Tab-separated table of C-alpha atoms and ligand atoms in Angstrom:
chain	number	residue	atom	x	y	z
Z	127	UNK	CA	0.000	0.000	0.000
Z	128	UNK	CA	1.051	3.402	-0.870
Z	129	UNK	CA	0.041	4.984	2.706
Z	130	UNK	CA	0.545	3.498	6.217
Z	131	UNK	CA	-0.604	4.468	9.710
Z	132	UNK	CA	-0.978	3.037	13.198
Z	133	UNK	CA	-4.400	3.289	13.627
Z	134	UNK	CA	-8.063	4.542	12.084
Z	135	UNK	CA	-11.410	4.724	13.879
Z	136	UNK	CA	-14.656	2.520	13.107
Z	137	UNK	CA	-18.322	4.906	13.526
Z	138	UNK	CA	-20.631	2.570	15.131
Z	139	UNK	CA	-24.234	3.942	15.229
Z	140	UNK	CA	-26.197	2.756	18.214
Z	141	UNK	CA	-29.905	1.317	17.439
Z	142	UNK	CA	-31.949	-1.785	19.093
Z	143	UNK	CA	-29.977	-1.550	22.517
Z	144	UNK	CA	-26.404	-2.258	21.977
Z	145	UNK	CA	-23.762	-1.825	24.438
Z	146	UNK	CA	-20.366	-0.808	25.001
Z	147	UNK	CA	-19.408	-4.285	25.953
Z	148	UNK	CA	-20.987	-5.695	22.798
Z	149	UNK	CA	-19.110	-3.198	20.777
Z	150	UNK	CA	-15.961	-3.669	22.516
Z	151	UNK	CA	-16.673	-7.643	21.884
Z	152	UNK	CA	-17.266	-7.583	18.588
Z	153	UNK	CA	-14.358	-5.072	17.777
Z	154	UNK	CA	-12.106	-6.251	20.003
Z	155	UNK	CA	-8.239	-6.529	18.717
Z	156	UNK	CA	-4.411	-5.295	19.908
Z	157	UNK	CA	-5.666	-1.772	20.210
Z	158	UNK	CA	-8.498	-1.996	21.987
Z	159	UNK	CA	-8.511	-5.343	23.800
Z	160	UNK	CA	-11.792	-7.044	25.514
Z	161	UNK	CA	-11.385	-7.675	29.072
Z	162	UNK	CA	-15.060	-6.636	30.263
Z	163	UNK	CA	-13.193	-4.550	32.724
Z	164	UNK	CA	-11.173	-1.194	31.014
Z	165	UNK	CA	-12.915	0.601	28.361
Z	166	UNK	CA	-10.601	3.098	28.578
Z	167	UNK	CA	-9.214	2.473	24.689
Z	168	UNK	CA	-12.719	3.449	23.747
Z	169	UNK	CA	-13.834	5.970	25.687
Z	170	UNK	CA	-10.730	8.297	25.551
Z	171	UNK	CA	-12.313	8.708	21.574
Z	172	UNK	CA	-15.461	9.106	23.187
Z	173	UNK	CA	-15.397	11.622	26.041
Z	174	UNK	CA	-18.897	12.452	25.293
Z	175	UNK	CA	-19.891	9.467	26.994
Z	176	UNK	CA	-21.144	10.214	30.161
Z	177	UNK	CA	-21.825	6.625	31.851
Z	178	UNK	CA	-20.086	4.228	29.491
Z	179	UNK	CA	-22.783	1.805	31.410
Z	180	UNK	CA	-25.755	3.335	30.006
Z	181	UNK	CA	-25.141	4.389	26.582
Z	182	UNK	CA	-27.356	6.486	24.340
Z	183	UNK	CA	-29.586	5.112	21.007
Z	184	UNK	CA	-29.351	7.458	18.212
Z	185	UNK	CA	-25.642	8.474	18.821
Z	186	UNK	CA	-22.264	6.895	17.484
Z	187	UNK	CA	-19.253	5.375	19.260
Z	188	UNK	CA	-15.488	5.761	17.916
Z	189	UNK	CA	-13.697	2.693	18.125
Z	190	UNK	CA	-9.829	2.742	17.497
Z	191	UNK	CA	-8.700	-0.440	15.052
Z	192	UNK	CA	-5.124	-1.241	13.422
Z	193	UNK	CA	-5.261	-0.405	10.112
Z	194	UNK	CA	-3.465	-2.962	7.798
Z	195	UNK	CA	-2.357	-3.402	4.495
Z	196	UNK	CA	-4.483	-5.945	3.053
Z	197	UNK	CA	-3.714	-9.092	-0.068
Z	198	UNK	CA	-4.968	-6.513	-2.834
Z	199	UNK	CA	-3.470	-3.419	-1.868
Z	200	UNK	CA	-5.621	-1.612	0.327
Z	201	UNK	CA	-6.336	-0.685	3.313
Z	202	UNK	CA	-7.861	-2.333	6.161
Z	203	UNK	CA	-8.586	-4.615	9.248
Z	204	UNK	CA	-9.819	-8.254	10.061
Z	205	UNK	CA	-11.852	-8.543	13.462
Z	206	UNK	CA	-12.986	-12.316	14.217
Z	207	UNK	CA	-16.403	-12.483	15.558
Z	208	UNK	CA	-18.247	-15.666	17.509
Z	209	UNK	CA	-21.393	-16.280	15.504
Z	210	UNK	CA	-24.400	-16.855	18.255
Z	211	UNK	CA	-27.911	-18.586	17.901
Z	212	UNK	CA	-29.623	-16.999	14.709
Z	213	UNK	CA	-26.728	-14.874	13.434
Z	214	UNK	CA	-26.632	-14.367	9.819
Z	215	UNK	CA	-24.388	-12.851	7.601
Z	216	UNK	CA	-27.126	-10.320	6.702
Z	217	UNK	CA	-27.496	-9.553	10.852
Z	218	UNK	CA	-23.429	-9.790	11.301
Z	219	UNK	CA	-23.142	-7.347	8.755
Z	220	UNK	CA	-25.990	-4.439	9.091
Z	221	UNK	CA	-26.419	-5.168	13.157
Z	222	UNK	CA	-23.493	-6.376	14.927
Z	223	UNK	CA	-21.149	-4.787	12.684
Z	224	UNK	CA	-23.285	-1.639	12.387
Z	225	UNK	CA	-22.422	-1.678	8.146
Z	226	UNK	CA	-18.954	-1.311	8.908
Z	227	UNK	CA	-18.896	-4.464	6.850
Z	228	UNK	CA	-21.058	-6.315	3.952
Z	229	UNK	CA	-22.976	-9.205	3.950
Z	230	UNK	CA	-21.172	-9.305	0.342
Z	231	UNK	CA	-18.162	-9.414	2.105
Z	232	UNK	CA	-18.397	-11.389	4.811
Z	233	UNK	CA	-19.867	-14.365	2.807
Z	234	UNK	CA	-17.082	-14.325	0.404
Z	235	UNK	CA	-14.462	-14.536	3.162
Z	236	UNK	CA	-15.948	-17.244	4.902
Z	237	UNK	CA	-16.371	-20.972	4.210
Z	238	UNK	CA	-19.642	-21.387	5.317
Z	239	UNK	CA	-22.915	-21.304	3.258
Z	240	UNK	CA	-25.062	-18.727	4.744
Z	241	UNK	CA	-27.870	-20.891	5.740
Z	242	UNK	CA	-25.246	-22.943	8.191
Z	243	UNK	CA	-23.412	-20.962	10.353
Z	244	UNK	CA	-22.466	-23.008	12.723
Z	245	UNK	CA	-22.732	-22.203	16.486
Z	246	UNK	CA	-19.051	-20.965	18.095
Z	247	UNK	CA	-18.010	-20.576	14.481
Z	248	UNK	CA	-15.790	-17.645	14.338
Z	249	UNK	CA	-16.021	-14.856	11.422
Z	250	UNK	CA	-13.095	-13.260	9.673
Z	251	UNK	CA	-14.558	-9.753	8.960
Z	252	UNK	CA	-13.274	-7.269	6.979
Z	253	UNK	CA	-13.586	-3.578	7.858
Z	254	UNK	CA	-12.008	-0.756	5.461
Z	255	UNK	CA	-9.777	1.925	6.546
Z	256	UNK	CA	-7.899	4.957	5.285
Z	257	UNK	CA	-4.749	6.393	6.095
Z	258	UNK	CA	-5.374	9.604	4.120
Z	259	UNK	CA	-3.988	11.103	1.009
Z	260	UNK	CA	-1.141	13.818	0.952
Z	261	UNK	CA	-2.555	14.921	-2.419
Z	262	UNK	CA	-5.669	15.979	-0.656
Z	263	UNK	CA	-4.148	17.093	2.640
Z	264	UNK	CA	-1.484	17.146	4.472
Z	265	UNK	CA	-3.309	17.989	7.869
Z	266	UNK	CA	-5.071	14.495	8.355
Z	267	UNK	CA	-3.773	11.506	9.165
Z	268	UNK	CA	-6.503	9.657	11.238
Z	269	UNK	CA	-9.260	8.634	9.435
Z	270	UNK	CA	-13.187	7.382	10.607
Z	271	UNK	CA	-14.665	4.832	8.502
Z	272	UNK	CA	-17.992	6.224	8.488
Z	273	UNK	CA	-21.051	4.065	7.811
Z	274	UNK	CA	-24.230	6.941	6.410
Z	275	UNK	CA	-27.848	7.288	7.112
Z	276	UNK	CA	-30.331	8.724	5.897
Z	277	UNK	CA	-30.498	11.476	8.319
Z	278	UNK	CA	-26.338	12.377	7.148
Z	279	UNK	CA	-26.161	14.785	4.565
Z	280	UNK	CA	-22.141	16.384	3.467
Z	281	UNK	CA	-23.293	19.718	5.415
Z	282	UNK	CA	-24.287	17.834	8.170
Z	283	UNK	CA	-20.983	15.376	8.633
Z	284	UNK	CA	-18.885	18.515	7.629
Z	285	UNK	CA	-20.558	20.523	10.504
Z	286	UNK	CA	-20.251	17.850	13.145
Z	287	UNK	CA	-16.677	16.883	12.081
Z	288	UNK	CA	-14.779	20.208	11.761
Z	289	UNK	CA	-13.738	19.456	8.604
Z	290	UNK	CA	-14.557	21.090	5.659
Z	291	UNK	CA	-17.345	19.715	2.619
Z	292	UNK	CA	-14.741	20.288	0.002
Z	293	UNK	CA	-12.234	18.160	2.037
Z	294	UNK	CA	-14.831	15.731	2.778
Z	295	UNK	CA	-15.956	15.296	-0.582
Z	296	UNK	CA	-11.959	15.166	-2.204
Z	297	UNK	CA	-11.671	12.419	0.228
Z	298	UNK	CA	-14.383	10.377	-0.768
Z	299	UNK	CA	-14.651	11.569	-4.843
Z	300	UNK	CA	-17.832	11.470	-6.646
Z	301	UNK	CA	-19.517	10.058	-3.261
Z	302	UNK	CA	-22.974	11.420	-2.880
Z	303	UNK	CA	-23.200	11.995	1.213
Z	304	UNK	CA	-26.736	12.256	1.410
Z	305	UNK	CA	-27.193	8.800	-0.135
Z	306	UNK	CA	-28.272	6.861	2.877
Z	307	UNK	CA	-25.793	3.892	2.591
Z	308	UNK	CA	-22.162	3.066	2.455
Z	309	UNK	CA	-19.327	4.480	3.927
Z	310	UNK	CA	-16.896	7.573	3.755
Z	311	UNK	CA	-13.679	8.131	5.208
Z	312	UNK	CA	-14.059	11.101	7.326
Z	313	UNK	CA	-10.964	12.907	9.497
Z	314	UNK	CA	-10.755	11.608	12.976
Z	315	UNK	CA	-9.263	13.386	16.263
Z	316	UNK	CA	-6.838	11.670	18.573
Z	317	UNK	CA	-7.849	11.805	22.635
Z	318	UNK	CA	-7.077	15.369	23.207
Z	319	UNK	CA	-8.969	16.693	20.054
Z	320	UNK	CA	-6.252	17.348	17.730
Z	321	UNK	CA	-6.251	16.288	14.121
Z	322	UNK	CA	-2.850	13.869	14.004
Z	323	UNK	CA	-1.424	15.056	10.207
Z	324	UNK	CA	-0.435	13.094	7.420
Z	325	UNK	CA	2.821	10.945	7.572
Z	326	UNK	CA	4.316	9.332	4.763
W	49	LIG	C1	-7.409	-11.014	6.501
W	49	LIG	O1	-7.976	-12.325	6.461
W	49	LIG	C2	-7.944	-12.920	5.177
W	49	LIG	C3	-8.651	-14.292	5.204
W	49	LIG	O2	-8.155	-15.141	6.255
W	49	LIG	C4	-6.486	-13.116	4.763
W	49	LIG	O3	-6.478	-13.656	3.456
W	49	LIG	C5	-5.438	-14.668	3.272
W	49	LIG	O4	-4.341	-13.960	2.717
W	49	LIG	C6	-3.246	-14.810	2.396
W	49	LIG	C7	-2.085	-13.940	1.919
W	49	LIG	O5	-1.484	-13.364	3.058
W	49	LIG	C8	-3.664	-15.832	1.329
W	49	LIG	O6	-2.608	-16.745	1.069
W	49	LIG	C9	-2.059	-16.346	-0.226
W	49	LIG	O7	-2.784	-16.910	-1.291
W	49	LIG	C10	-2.212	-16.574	-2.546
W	49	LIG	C11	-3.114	-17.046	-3.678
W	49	LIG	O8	-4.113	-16.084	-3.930
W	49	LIG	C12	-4.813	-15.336	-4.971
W	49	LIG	O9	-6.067	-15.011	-4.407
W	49	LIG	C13	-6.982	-14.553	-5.375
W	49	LIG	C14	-8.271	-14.061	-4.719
W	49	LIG	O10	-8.027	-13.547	-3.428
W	49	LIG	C15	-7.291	-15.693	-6.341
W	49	LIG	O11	-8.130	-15.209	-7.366
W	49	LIG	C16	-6.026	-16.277	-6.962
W	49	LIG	O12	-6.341	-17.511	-7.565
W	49	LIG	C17	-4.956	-16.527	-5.913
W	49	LIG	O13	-5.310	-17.690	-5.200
W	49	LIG	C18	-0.847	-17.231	-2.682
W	49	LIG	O14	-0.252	-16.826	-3.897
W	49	LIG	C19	0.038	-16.833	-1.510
W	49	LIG	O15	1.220	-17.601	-1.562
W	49	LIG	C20	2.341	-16.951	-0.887
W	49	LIG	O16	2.567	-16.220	0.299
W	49	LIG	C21	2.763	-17.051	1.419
W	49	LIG	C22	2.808	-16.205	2.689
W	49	LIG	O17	1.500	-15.831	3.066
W	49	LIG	C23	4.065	-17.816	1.222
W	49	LIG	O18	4.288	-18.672	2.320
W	49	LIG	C24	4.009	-18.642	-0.055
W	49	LIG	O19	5.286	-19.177	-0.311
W	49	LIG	C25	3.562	-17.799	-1.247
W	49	LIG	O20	4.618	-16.982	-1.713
W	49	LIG	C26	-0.698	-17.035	-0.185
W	49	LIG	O21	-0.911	-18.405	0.080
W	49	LIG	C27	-4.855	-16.654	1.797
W	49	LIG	O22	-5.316	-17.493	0.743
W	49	LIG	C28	-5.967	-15.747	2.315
W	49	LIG	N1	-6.976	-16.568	2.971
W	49	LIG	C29	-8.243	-16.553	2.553
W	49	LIG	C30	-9.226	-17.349	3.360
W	49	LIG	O23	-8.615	-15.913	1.566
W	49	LIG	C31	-5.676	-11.814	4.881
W	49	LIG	O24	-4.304	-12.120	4.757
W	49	LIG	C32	-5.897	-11.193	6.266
W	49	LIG	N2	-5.143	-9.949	6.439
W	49	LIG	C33	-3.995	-9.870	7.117
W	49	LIG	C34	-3.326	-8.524	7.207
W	49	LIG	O25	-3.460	-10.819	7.661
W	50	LIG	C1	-26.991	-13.978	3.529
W	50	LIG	C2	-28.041	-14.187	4.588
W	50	LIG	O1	-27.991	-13.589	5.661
W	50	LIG	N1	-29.027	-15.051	4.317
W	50	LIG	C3	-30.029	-15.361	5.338
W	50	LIG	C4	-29.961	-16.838	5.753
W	50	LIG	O2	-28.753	-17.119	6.447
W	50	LIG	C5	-31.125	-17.188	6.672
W	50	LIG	O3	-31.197	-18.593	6.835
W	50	LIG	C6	-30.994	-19.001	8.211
W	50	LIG	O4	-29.575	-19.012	8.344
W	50	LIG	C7	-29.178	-19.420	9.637
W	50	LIG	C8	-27.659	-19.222	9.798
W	50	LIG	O5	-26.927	-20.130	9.002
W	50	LIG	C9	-29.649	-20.854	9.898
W	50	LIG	O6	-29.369	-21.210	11.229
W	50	LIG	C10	-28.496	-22.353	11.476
W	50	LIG	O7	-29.395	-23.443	11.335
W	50	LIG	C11	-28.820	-24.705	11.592
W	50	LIG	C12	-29.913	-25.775	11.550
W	50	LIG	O8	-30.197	-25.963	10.191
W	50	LIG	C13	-28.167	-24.766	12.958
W	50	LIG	O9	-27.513	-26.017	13.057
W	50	LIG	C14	-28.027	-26.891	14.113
W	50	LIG	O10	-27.767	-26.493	15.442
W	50	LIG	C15	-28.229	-27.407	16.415
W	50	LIG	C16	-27.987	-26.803	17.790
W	50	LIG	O11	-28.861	-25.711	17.980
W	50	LIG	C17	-27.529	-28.756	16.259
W	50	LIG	O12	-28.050	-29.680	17.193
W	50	LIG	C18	-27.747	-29.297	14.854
W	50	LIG	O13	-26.929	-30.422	14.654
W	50	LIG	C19	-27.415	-28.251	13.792
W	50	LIG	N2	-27.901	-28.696	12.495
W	50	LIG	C20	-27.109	-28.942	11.455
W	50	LIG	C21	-27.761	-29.578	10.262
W	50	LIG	O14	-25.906	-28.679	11.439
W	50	LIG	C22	-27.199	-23.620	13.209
W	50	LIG	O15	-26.825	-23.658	14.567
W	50	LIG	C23	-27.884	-22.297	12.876
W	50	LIG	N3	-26.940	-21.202	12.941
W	50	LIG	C24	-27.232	-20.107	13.639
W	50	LIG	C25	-26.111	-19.109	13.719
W	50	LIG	O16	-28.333	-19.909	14.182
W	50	LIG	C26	-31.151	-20.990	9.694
W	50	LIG	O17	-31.542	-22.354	9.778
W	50	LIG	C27	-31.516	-20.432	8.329
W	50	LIG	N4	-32.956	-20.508	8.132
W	50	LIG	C28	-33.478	-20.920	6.977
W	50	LIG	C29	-34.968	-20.793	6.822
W	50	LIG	O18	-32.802	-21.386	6.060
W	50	LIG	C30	-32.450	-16.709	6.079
W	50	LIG	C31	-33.587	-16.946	7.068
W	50	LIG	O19	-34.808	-16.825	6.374
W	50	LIG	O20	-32.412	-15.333	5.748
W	50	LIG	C32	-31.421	-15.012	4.803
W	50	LIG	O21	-31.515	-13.635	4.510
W	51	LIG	C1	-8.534	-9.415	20.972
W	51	LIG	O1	-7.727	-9.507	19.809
W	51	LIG	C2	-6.340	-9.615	20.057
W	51	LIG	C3	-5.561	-9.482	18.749
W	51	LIG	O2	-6.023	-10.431	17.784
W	51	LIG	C4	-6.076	-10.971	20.695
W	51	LIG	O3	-4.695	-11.093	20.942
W	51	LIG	C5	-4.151	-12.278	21.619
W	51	LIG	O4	-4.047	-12.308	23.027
W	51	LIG	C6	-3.372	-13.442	23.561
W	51	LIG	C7	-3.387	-13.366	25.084
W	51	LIG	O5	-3.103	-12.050	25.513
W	51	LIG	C8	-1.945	-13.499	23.015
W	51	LIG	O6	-1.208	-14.585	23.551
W	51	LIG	C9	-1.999	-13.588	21.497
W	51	LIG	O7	-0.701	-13.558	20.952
W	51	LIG	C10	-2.792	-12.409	20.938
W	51	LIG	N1	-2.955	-12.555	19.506
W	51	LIG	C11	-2.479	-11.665	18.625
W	51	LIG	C12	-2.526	-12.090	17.188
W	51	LIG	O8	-2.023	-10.551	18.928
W	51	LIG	C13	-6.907	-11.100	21.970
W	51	LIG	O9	-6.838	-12.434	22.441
W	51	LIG	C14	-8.385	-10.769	21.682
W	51	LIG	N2	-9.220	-10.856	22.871
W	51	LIG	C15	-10.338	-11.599	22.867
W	51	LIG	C16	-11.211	-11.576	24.089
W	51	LIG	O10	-10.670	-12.306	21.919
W	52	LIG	C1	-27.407	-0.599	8.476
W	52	LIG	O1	-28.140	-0.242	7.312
W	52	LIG	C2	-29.376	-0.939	7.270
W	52	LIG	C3	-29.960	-0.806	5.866
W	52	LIG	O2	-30.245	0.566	5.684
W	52	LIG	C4	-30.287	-0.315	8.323
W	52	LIG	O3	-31.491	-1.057	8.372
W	52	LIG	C5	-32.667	-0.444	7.769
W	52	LIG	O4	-33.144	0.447	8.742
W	52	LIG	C6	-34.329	1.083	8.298
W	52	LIG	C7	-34.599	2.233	9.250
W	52	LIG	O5	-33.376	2.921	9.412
W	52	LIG	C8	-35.483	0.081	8.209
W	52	LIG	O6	-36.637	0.698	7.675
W	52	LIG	C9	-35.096	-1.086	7.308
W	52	LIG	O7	-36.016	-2.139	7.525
W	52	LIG	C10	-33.668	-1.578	7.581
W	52	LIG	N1	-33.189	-2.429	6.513
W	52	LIG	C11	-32.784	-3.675	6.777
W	52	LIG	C12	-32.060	-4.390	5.672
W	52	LIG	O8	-32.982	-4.235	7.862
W	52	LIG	C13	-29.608	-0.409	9.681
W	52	LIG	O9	-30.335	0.271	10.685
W	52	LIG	C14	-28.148	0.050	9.658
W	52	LIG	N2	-27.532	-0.287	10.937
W	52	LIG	C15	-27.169	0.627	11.841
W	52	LIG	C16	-26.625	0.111	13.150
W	52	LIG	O10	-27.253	1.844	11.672
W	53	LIG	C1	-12.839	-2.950	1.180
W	53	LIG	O1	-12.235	-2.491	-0.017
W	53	LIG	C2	-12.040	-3.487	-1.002
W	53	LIG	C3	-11.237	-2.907	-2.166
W	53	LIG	O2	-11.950	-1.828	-2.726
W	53	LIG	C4	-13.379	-4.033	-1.487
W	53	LIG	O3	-13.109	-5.153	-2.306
W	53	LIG	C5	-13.921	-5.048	-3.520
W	53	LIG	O4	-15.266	-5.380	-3.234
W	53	LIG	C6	-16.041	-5.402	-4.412
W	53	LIG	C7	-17.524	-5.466	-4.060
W	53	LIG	O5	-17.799	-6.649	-3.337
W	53	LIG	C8	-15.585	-6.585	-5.259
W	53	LIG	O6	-16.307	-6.604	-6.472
W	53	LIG	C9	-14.088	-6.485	-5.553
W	53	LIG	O7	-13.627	-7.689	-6.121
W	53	LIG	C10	-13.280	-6.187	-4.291
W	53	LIG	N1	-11.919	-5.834	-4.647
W	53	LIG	C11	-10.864	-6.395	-4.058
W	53	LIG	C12	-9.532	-5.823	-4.440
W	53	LIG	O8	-10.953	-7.320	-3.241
W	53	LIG	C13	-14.209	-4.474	-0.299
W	53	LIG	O9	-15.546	-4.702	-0.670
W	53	LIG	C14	-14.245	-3.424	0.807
W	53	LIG	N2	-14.831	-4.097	1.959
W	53	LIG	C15	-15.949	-3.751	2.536
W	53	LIG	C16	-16.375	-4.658	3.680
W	53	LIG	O10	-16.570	-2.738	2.202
């Protein structure tokens, strides 16, 4: 891969009554490892998040992931889930993953045929990253890989991000923001709410 970095940010959008634990579960990894005990990893992205034992519906949680260069030259991450009773790759990928991943995806990276999953299988599943692109900026270095809504529009994620719409859009060319599905790559802040910059 052309770029390289130590670490990106997944959006996760909270609906149906997910928790921090789940999240932390299902993205667990080197940087921010599952122990049911120190969410700490998480919430420094997060300090928002008022009682990270009651979480809010309707908002999103940052999670930090190691962003890899992947067979096929570009840029991501593999998490490994543990499929439970009446998990399917449709579920895996629009619910527990939050659309951070595909069904598309996931079924092609897996050996099993979607109508048996077996229980305590374990998925591979692939999440996209970015690292940024010096020919677009050199100010940005951390990226979020941004599932949208309906409700996101580019005003709206430019607004809540800091970051300009023409960056945005550069970023994520020919992308229309307000289409309801997908993802972008959006500029992330580290703990303290600086942007990290571009390194080659
Ligand atoms: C994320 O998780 C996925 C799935 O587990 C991993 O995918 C595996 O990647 C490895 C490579 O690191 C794959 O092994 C390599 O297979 C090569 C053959 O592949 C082409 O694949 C395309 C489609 O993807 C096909 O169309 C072609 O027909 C080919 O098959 C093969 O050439 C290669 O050989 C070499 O490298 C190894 C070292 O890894 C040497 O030991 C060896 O001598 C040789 O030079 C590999 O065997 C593997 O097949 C993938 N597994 C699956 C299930 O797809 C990613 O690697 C994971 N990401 C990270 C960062 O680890
Ligand atoms: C892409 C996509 O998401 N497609 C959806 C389909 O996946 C979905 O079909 C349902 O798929 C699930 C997941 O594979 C499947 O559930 C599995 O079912 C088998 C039984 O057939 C279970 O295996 C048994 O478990 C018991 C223990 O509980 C064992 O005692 C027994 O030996 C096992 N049987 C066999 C033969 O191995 C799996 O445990 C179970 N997996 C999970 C994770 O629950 C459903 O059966 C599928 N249902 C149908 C109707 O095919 C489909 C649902 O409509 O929707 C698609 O969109
Ligand atoms: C979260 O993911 C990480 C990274 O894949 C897992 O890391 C392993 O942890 C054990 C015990 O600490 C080590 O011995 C292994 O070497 C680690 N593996 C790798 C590849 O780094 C960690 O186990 C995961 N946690 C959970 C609960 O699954
Ligand atoms: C992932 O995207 C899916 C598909 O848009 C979302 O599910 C849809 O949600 C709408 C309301 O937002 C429902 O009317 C549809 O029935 C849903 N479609 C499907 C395929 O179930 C889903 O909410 C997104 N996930 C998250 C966590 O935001
Ligand atoms: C992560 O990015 C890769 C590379 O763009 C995507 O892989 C492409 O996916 C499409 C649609 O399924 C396939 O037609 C191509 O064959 C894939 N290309 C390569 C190089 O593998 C992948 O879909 C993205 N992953 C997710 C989960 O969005």
């Amino acid at each position: 891969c052309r770029t390289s970095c130590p670490l990106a940010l997944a959006s996760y959008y909270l609906e149906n009554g997910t928790t921090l634990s789940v999240i932390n579960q299902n993205l667990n990894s080197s940087i921010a490892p599952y122990d049911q005990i120190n969410f700490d990893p998480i919430l420094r992205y997060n300090s928002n998040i008022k009682d990270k034992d009651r979480i809010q519906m309707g908002s999103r949680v940052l999670v930090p992931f190691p962003c890899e260069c992947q067979p096929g030259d570009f840029l991501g991450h593999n998490f490994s889930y543990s499929v439970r009773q009446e998990d399917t790759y449709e579920r895996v990928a629009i619910s527990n993953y939050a659309n951070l991943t595909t069904m598309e995806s996931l079924q092609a990276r897996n050996p099993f045929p979607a109508t048996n999953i077996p229980l305590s299988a374990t998925l591979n599943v692939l999440v996209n990253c970015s690292c940024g692109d010096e020919s677009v900026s050199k100010d940005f270095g951390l990226f979020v890989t941004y599932p949208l809504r309906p409700e996101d529009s580019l005003s709206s994620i430019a607004r809540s991000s800091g970051v300009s719409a023409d960056i945005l859009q550069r970023y994520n060319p020919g992308v229309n923001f307000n289409s309801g599905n997908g993802i972008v790559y959006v500029p992330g802040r580290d703990p303290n709410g600086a942007f990290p910059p571009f390194k080659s």
